[PDB]
Every structure is written in structure tokens, then in C-alpha cells.
Amino acid sequence: AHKSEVAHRFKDLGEENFKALVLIAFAQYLQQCPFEDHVKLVNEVTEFAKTCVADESAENCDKSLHTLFGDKLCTVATLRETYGEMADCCAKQEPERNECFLQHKDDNPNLPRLVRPEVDVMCTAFHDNEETFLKKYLYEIARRHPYFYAPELLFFAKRYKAAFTECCQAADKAACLLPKLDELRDEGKASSAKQRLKCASLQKFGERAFKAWAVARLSQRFPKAEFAEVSKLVTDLTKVHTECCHGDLLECADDRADLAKYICENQDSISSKLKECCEKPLLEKSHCIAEVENDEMPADLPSLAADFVESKDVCKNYAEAKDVFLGMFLYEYARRHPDYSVVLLLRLAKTYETTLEKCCAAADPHECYAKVFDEFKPLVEEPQNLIKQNCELFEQLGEYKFQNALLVRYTKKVPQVSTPTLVEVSRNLGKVGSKCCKHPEAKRMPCAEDYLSVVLNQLCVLHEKTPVSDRVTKCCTESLVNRRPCFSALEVDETYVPKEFNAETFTFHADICTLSEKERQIKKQTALVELVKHKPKATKEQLKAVMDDFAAFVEKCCKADDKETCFAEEGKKLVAASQAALG
Ligand code: HEM
Ligand SMILES: CCCCCCCCCCCCCC(=O)O
Ligand SMILES: CCCCCCCCCCCCCC(=O)O
Ligand SMILES: CCCCCCCCCCCCCC(=O)O
Ligand SMILES: CCCCCCCCCCCCCC(=O)O
Ligand SMILES: CCCCCCCCCCCCCC(=O)O
């Protein structure tokens, strides 16, 4: 509705947010134009918006947002010279014009990777002009990530602003700042990866699969909501997810805004944890509702045995509307289990489905599916035990040593993966342990699921078009519900031919003593991987012995008079003895 949509958007978003969003929008299309050009564009658009705010009847104010945005894009002088055929989109009637612009966004613009400046430099730039400093980076990230949901970039921005504001006036600027920048950076990459994984998953596995996932996730989140409400929400969420995957900012923003609005106007039928965020500005509503903690589930809910196993109408109810019945099963199981990963829940539903498909065709269905819940136990226990053993291992080893244990275990399983990748995945997996094991058992599986989906997705992306193992491909292309267990099922590669010994690979220098904590760990874990690759049959026990000799080697040589030679000569003996021990 509204006479002037731009005026309406300006009034609701507020000038500052409007300007930041217009900047992101333009940067995501004019990925090659300079920052100053974008600033000029934003000011021009904002000044126009203001005329509309002052008067909805002002000239051009009644044009749609897409029309106005596309027109502005087409007034860019160097459009054809810089963007080639994208300039051809201007010859199209708006509707088709927007689609054309959308399809011309470059998800890999081949721009130089952003590098973190020195703390003193960053902080000083921040101080000299926070606005420009922040907007400059907002522009650099946006143009490198067209498709990254614009509003979400605004949330990251405000978090960076806070990080710099607090850390740049602290006693130990770097100690304060860097960890925060590391976190933001990681969350950013993860969010981007997550956004792509979800759309890729929708594409490959279909809408039904997404709806199943949605029923489970929404049910854990809103356990007190009726199934019909959850069902309605899954339909709306599927639409938002599908349209947001199409990529148009406005269409996606309006869909999310619509859903958030519906949710907020129906809190009594959805959850008691939404008050604080249903009071938030339109811009932040959906984002905040998306992070709302699970509502508390209804007290002493009955077992599902009655309706899904004991009832005489099980097969009758199932056959009449299979997906609806399975959806009900999933909703009842999930609302009761916020402690399960969504995929575990999907494996339980699939198991139930398979049994009903088999049993309902039997002469006497009930006799056949009577013990279906028994089939659930082993499925639930697998992740549960895996988390127990890993958190127990982590608690007795520490993050670093924990990563190293994973490093050796995975290298042995897939020795063909590149060393840098084995190190990175192992380290990241070590962190998920450090992060999730800090949660009580009740919240560990969902945590692991969320973080592992990131780490494993990244591994899969790297393996994609850089494959080295059919088994990794299998796990990466299999159903997302069988992804993690598939990786867990990898066995030691016994066909792996030991990698020839490379002297250079096992030669260390005094510089190792001056590297940062991170750089040092990476050098050691890198050498550890190469060690396992060269001696794949070396037992974890034999490896520890060599690791201890090495540990004593670096320590009992980094701090020992003027010696840049106790690495060369003492290293020669270490390598010689190790080759013997592992021979
Ligand atoms: C305006 C606020 C900012 C936002 C919204 C933002 C957002 C992001 C996002 C979403 C990513 C990950 C993208 C990916 O998937 O690769 C990222 C990465 C990164 N950001 Fe920011 N950022 C902001 C400000 C800054 C600032 C002020 C700095 C440095 C002074 C910075 C330095 C970096 C670095 C070094 C990376 C890693 C790049 C890479 O590994 O290729 N960011 N940022
Ligand atoms: C609104 C109700 C939506 C119900 C969705 C059907 C549920 C299907 C459960 C079967 C699980 C399949 C798992 C998978 O897609 O990989
Ligand atoms: C050049 C025109 C720029 C128009 C500004 C784009 C509108 C931003 C919509 C952001 C609202 C997000 C709400 C949500 O996620 O629920
Ligand atoms: C670079 C390739 C690494 C391959 C290792 C498989 C991926 C890790 C399996 C997923 C983690 C499961 C949790 C665990 O460690 O028990
Ligand atoms: C690499 C260290 C991971 C530490 C956390 C334990 C992870 C155990 C796997 C849990 C998987 C949950 C999702 C699923 O149901 O498959
Ligand atoms: C061919 C023999 C090479 C012997 C040197 C092994 C180097 C591997 C370093 C292992 C790192 C262990 C972790 C640590 O001590 O911090």
C-alpha cells in the first residue's frame, strides 16, 4: 500500500538505517564502483526520499522501490563500460528489469581479500572518522557478498562499532579488540555459508524436506503452540526461505517483516518469550525473533505411544494424509525434545515413516509397528554418546591437545585431504568442542549441530571442485540429515600409501619461537599432519612420543643461549630418531 513507498520506508527505518541500507543495496549491485560514488548515490537517493517524506505527492514519489532503484542504477554513467551486459538490463520493463539486475550480481567479483590492519591503525582511523570508517567496510563487505541479507550486515556493523568503541580506549587495545574481530569475522563467514547452504539444500532436497526441518525447529522453539499454528508458521517460513533464496532484498525483507508481524500479533498462540522483541523496530524484529530462546514446554506432556503406536487409527490416520501425520509426529517429538538436534528428529521421523510404510501394508499393522519406539533409542544414543566421549576427551585434554587428537584421527581417515584443510577443520572442530561442551547436556546436541553444520559445510565447499576422496563427496552430497553421521562413519584409510619423507617439511627454525600463539600452533599442527601422512601406521602412542621429543626440542632450544643452530643440529637428531622410532 502507501502512496509513497520510499517515504514509508524512510519513516519506518529512520534516516540513518535507510542510508546504510541504500548503501548496501547499491554496493551489492555496483560491486565495482568506488566508495565515494556510492556515497554520492546514497545522498542523492536520501535527499529524494526526504522530498517524499515531506510530501508523498511530490514528483516520482509514488513510484515503486524497484522502479526507483532500477532507474537510479540506470543513470550510472559507466554502467556498460564497467558492468557490460548488466547495462542491458536498463532496456527492460521494470519487472523484468529487476530480475535481470538480480541475475547479474557477481557472487565472486574477484576483489582482493580484506586484510585486518594493525590495531593502532584501525583505532586511529576509527577515531578520525567512525562514520566513514564503518561505512567504508560495510561497502567492502557488501560488494564482496551480494546476496548477504542487507539488514543482517547492519547488525554486524553495530557490533563492530561497539568493539572499536570499547577496545580503542582500553589499556590493552589489541587484547580487547582482536578476539572480538575474530568472533565477528567467524560469525560473518558462517552466516554467509549458512545462508548459501540453506538455499542449496532447498534446491537439492526439495520443499518437503525443508518443511520437515521447519516443523521440527519451530516445534522445539514454540512447544506450547498448537500443531495447526506450527503448520501455518512452516508454510510462511517456507515462503520466506524460498523467496529470500531468490535473492531480492525487498521481497525477502517484506516477507520476513510480514512473518515477524504475524508472529508478534499472535504471541499468545506461539510463545511467551517474544514480548521484548515484538516491541522492537520493524528492522530488527525478524532477526531477533530468529534468535529467541525456546519457550518452556508444557508440563508433563503425555508419551507419543498413545497416538502414534497404541491408537487403532494409526495407519488410517497416516494413510489419509501422510505428510500431515508425519508432521504431527515430528511436532510432538520435537516440542518434547529441544535437547535433540533437528537432524536427529528428522532421522526419527524418517524411521517412523519407513516403519509405517512397511507395516501399514501388513495384514496386522499394530503387531508390526508396535515396537517402533525401540528403533529410536540407538539413533538418539549415537549423538548423545559421541558428545559425551568428545566433551569428556576435551575436558581432560584442553582445546589445543584436543584439536591435535582430532588432527591425527582425521588425517588417518582421509590422508588425501590437503594439510591446510586438515589443520583448519581439526582446529575448528576443536573449537566447537570448546564452545558446546560448556553447555549442560540438555543443550549440547543442538549446539553441536549448529556449529558442525558450519564446519562441515566449509569442508564440503572446499572439497567441492577440489575433491580428493569419493567418501568425502558421498558425505557431502548425501542427505543433510545423514551428513554428520556419514563423516563420523569414515574409517581409517588402509589403502593409503605413506607420503615420501620431505626434509624441508620437517625442518624447524628459531622463528618458531617468535610466532604468535596461533601461528605457532598452526606450524606444529601442520607438522603433525605431515608426520601422520608420512607415517600413517604410527600409533597415537608412538606419535605422542615423537611429539614429546619435538616439544622438548623446541622448548629446550628456544630458551637456550644464542642458538639458531640448536634447531638445525638438534633438529637433525630429532628427525633421525623419529624416523627410527616410527620405522
Ligand atoms: C561495517 C561493519 C562490518 C560488517 C557488517 C562486516 C561484516 C563482515 C562479514 C559478514 C564477514 C565475513 C564474510 C565472508 O563470508 O567471507 C567479514 C569478514 C572480515 N572482516 Fe568485516 N565487517 C565489518 C567491519 C570490519 C572492519 C571495520 C574490519 C577491519 C578493520 C573488518 C575486517 C574483516 C576481515 C579481516 C574479515 C575476514 C576477510 C577474509 O577472511 O577474507 N570488518 N566482515
Ligand atoms: C506442515 C507439516 C509438514 C510435514 C513435513 C513432512 C515430514 C516428513 C518427515 C520425514 C522426514 C524426512 C527427512 C528428510 O527430508 O531428509
Ligand atoms: C534504494 C532503496 C533502498 C530501500 C531500503 C531497503 C529496505 C530495507 C528493508 C529492511 C527491513 C528488514 C526487516 C526484516 O528483516 O524483517
Ligand atoms: C579435512 C577432512 C576432515 C574429515 C574428518 C571428518 C569430519 C569430522 C566429523 C564430524 C565431527 C563429529 C564429532 C566427533 O569428532 O566425534
Ligand atoms: C569435533 C568435536 C565435537 C564436539 C561436540 C560433539 C559432537 C558430537 C556429534 C553431535 C552431532 C549432533 C547432530 C546430529 O544429530 O548429527
Ligand atoms: C620425520 C620426523 C619429524 C619429527 C618432528 C615432528 C613434528 C611434529 C610436531 C608435533 C606437534 C605437537 C604439539 C606440541 O608439542 O605443541
Number of the ligand 1 atom closest to the C-alpha atom of 189: 15
- The CATH number covering residue 261 comes to 1.10.246.10
Indicate whether 91 and 66 sit together in one domain: yes
Number of other residues whose CB lies within 10 A of the CB of residue 137: 18
How far apart CA 174 and CA 544 sit, in angstroms, is 34
Please give the full DSSP string across 197-219, using - where no structure is assigned.
HHHHHHHHH-HHHHHHHHHHHHH
Is residue 529 located within the same domain as residue 432? no
Other Cβ atoms less than 10 A from the Cβ of 362: the count is 12
| Cα–Cα distance for residue pair 430/451, rounded to 1 Å | 11
Q: Among 295, 323, 346, where does a domain finish? A: 295
17's CB contacts (< 8 A; 6+ apart) are: 154, 283
CB 464 within 8 A of CB 418: no
> Which helix or strand (DSSP H or E) is residue 448 part of?
helix 441-463
CA dihedral 281, 287, 291, 292 (to 10 degrees): 40
Tell me, yes or no, whether 229 and 323 share the same domain.
Answer: no
Residue 581 lies in a domain: no
- Residue 494, C-alpha cell as written in the block: 588402509
Mention every residue, 6+ apart, whose C-beta is less than 8 A from residue 329.
304, 308, 349, 352
Say if ligand 5 is within 6 A of residue 454 CB: no
537: Cβ contacts below 8 Å, ≥ 6 apart: 498
Closest ligand to the CA of 149 = 3
Please indicate, yes or no, if residue 434 is contained in any of the structural domains.
yes
Same domain, 320 and 362: yes
Task: Tell how far the Cα of 30 is from the centroid of ligand 2, in angstroms.
Answer: 40
Largest CA-CA distance found in the chain, in angstroms, rounded: 86
List the one residue out of 431, 423, 437 whose CA is nearest residue 454.
Answer: 431
Domain C-terminal end among 196, 224, 249: 196
- For a mutational test of ligand 5's pocket, the pick from 217, 387, 457, i.e. the residue with the most ligand atoms closer than 8 A to its C-beta, is 387
321: alpha, beta or left? (left if phi > 0; alpha if psi -120 to 50): beta
The Cα-based distances of 467 to 389, 477, 534 in angstroms read 30, 12, 21
Task: Dig out the grid coordinates for 497 from the structure.
Answer: 600409501
Nearest CA to ligand 1 atom 4: 157
The boundaries of the domain holding residue 285 are 204-295
Distance 486 CA to ligand 6 centre (A): 30
Cβ(163) – ligand 1 distance below 6 Å:
no
What torsion, rounded to 10 degrees, do the Cα atoms 454, 251, 53, 57 define?
170
CA–CA distances in Å: residue 437 to residues 21, 227, 388: 38, 32, 9
Cβ atoms of 195 and 214 within 8 Å: the answer is no
- Resolution (angstroms) stands at 1.9
Specify the length of the chain in residues.
583
SS (H, E, C) 308-359: HHHCCCHHHHHHHCHHHHHHHHHHHHHHCCCCCCHHHHHHHHHHHHHHHHHH
- Domains of the chain: total: 6
Task: Give the method of determination.
Answer: X-ray
Judge if 73 and 158 occupy the same domain.
Answer: no
Distance CA 140, CA 24 (A): 9
Neighbours of 301 (CB within 10 A): 11
User: Which of 196, 229, 254 is the last residue before a domain boundary?
Assistant: 196
∠ Cα 44 49 53 (to 5°): 150
66 appears as a binding residue in the annotation: yes
Q: Provide the 3-class DSSP secondary structure of residue 420.
A: helix
Shared domain for 479 and 521, answered yes or no, is no
Closest CA to 201 of 532, 457, 6: 457
Of all atoms in ligand 1, which is nearest to the CA of residue 193?
A: 15
